[model samples]
Target: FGQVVADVLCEFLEVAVHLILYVREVYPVGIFQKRKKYNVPVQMSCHPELNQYIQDTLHCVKPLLEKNDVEKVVVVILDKEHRPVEKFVFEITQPPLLSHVEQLLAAFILKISVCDAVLDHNPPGCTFTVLVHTREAATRNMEKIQVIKDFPWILADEQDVHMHDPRLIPLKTMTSDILKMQLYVEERAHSKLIGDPNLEFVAMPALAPPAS
Candidate 1:
């Protein structure tokens, strides 16, 4: 039933992506629209460019999930200098067959919706990228698939994935037999919050750009 898990997990991830962007304020409020998924209200992005990116990213990940080649998927938020401000990690492992999958998945949404209260606001001019951490043995597997089409992936930059003594907060856990997942976040230490003067100036030009 690996294919079953892949379908369910990826579907849940699609919801998580938009919800994370909404709660983290990665984009303006006007870009998001309130919608319901998994029987709960969620904030989903309406930006076509963003929607396509998330869709393509997940499209590439589905095959790996089906093969059980993925270890975890991380949503990393970065500052202008390309430094990581926060990381939302979804650690997954094959789970036993069980019912109640929807209820378990919906609970993830509930916790993520309120996660902002438990986390700090990311720095201004922040952006995000989704990272899929493949199993070690999957390296050869990845190389072989490069010729298979539309599976573009690269080794993540060291700084983008590492943190120095960051605070770890557990957001939610899915301990159900169908999908075992541990969702959490890592916030950089207070010492790293020094605002860059250049970054402030950079934001000015972005806001003043002429309309196309």
Candidate 2:
């Protein structure tokens, strides 16, 4: 049962990372838009709810990911346009996000269309799933489990920890200890916004980490 949970979580993290990258790229910090001039820099901020959701998702999956017993897990990355970009099943016991950036970049390029773009649209939806194989002997116990609609995000508030069953770690620890990985785009203006009245336009620098 412990192994089953860990396997499921590993798959979840794989999906979650890709989703985070796409979300950040579409709604970056300090983004702005102007109707008069398309050339004006746009600074868009992420929704507070979305930020919370990402944090919660990570917290829920962290313990299972850290477990020493689990041997291997698979991760699949879906592109912005909702297409599968890459898929791999590896036998590592730690978090796999950092190591899988190359495959993610390949997918990002295909989805984003070009390396350089002033603006991009958000994707409709993305999903993650885990496949579990149990070591228990075969019996007449085979059954189908259905997730209830009312259940909150698998890693929502700490209160939702009960949803994982038997391996109940304290909710506070999960919520507090999980680290949040963030992706940001920095825009540098050649001239100051306050003092530059004569300067109609300023060159802006687009800088951000590659999709991971």
Which is the leading candidate under lDDT? Answer: 1
TM-scores of the models, in the order given: 0.82, 0.27
- In candidate 1, residue 126 scores what lDDT? 73
Residues 1-212, candidate 1: write the lDDT tens digits: 67888889888898898898888888877888999977889998888878766766777777777877677888877775668888889998875333477888888899999999989777777788777776533222445223325436555556657776899988888776656888999988853233532211000001111111
Which pairs of residues clash in candidate 2, taking residues 3 or more apart in a chain or in different chains?
A: 30-43, 31-42, 31-43, 31-44, 32-42, 32-43
In TM-score terms, which candidate is top? Answer: 1
Clashing pairs in 1: none
> What does the lDDT read for residue 89 in candidate 2?
29
Q: Tell me the number of clashing residue pairs for each predicted model.
A: 0, 6
Residue 180, candidate 1: Cα error in Å is 0.7
Candidate 2, 1-212: lDDT as tens digits: 33544544444443433343443343343332212111222222244544443444334334434443233322223345434333222333323232243233234223222312422333334332222221223222322111222212221122211121221111111111122212122111115445543322111011111222
RMSDs, each prediction? 9.1, 22.0
